[PDB]
């Protein structure tokens with residue numbers, strides 16, 4: 188029983204975090220086999236900032252300009268290359284703690300764990316969702332660039348996010364581990380801002396099912412709606428439209444509770460139109476949308 | 489920027505989790521040096537449950553009755569003893585991954601990270617607070633007993649909680665690592681239930697300061713209250729009384745924001761008496777009380 192924001196155990200990732208220094212700039216790198224991955228803006232200098240050309244800047248670098256530190260051990264850089272917005276630094280030592288891993292790009296609405304690091308040292312772990320506008324609402328201070336986001340499937344770490352920057356509204360933007368940004372953002376100083384966001388409807392429904400699994404039932408009703416009439420109401424409250432595929436994904440939770448998806452949608456419609464009226468669901472006074480159907484099944488069978 | 493429920497990196501603890509089996513009962517143990525620690529009710533059998541005597545039950549056990557598995561390796565038990573409500577199993581191998589550690593008992597209102605484990609394998613990590621009634625609102629399924637709660641200070645793990653049981657309202661109860669229960673609970677089947685709880689006032693104030701540090705300011709006011717008139721209002725809403733020591737602990741946050749503690753208390757008083765009126769603070773629609781002043785300073789300078 189109970190339901191918490193839960194992250195994956197971070198040990199497999201902690202053994203991969205290193206510190207990368209270029210001149211007076213220090214951030215975090217990810218050390219897998221004989222390669223270190225880090226944000227390319229580590230080579231940015233002062234009088235660049237505005238309109239940098241990273242191709243020019245990297246051509247002017249030498250291997251000895253990059254200082255890589257794995258705890259108290261310095262790693263010798265023997266090659267370097269640009270991988271879109273990430274730098275690949277070949278080192279003379281393969282990481283003995285390299286886990287089984289994959290580089291995977293996630294979709295809006297999916298969740299992952301973030302290991303926040305400073306100076307190559309892990310600081311804390313938390314759980315995030317990729318928003319509809321391709322930002323994440325993280326917790327990051329200056330020096331956290333290069334921190335990574337990940338999921339774990341059995342023994343294999345799926346890396347999906349490297350942290351690059353903070354936007355004016357305090358939300359965060361980054362790339363996959365191939366160096367391709369999530370969303371329409373660039374690693375330089377522009378007036379760029381996050382687009383509009385929506386609520387992840389399938390996730391809210393998943394969380395209502397977690398509530399019922401845990402004994403919170405006050406929001407349930409005898410009513411059932413159609414998928415069409417539900418989406419009419421969802422647009423008014425800036426929820427994502429619900430599709431038949433979302434209904435299928437909620438099948439297992441629907442079977443376990445005996446509550447059909449379209450019956451739970453009639454509860455969500457009433458909560459939107461009336462509010463909670465002073466009550467809470469799973470300790471929250473608003474509808475939470477950062478738990479996937481998978482997160483729910485994993486945490487509370 | 490940003491503020492998240494954040495747990496400590498769990499790698500140092502993951503390397504200590506093992507699986508302990510007695511007969512048909514399997515749960516989690518903590519392997520430090522040449523000792524495994526686990527809940528003593530692993531020796532409970534069926535026709536005991538009601539009124540067990542653990543002294544009798546342990547006298548009837550032999551070392552070979554305990555099967556300890558560290559991943560794919562079986563550890564040989566060479567001694568056993570009762571430590572209040574925890575069992576100490578001496579094994580023939582010292583854990584090569586033993587971190588620097590301490591056994592520390594925490595106070596209500598303090599927080600810690602929980603590494604939930606099943607069959608000796610870590611499953612997820614999350615952050616908890618010890619409540620005023622000595623329960624924690626965790627996320628635990630059958631088989632999670634022996635999972636531990638901890639904090640990390642530099643390189644040293646302070647273990648503070650081992651999980652033992654779930655209470656009827658779905659909250660959780662356990663012991664420190666010396667085997668002494670938090671609160672008036674026993675490891676047997678009785679009608680025991682959690683006592684009444686209060687809101688941790690110093691933590692709510694810490695979280696309001698985190699909100700101001702992150703740019704959420706709508707709840708601020710020009711007013712200041714006395715410590716006496718604030719506590720008059722806190723009792724009506726079931727908040728813990730605020731003391732001068734709490735004011736001192738909030739000093740650093742007060743200095744950084746320029747908002748005196750008693751000025752922030754006049755904001756808390758108005759939120760209690762009027763509510764939020766449809767707005768949120770740090771993404772929450774209620775006042776959060778599971779972040780300590782230390783948690784806040786650590787996460788957002």
Ligand SMILES: Cc1ccc(NC(=O)c2ccc(CN3CCNCC3)cc2)cc1Nc1nc(-c2cccnc2)cs1
Nearest residue numbers: 211212228231232233327328329351352353374375489
């Ligand atoms: C997208 C991007 C492009 C270029 C840079 N690098 C710079 O702007 C930069 C690099 C080097 C210098 C020169 N030195 C100045 C003195 N300190 C050492 C560096 C000055 C500025 C950083 C970023 N990303 C950043 N993310 C943050 C940040 C803040 C809070 C939370 N998460 C990320 C600050 S900067």
Ligand SMILES: Cc1ccc(NC(=O)c2ccc(CN3CCNCC3)cc2)cc1Nc1nc(-c2cccnc2)cs1
Nearest residue numbers: 188512513529532533534628629630652653654675676
């Ligand atoms: C406090 C306590 C005292 C004694 C026991 N052990 C038993 O009740 C017990 C032990 C052995 C057996 C016999 N076998 C029965 C068939 N399965 C194997 C065991 C039957 C019952 C467990 C506990 N603690 C428990 N915590 C949970 C629990 C559930 C969900 C989340 N967190 C903890 C279930 S039981």
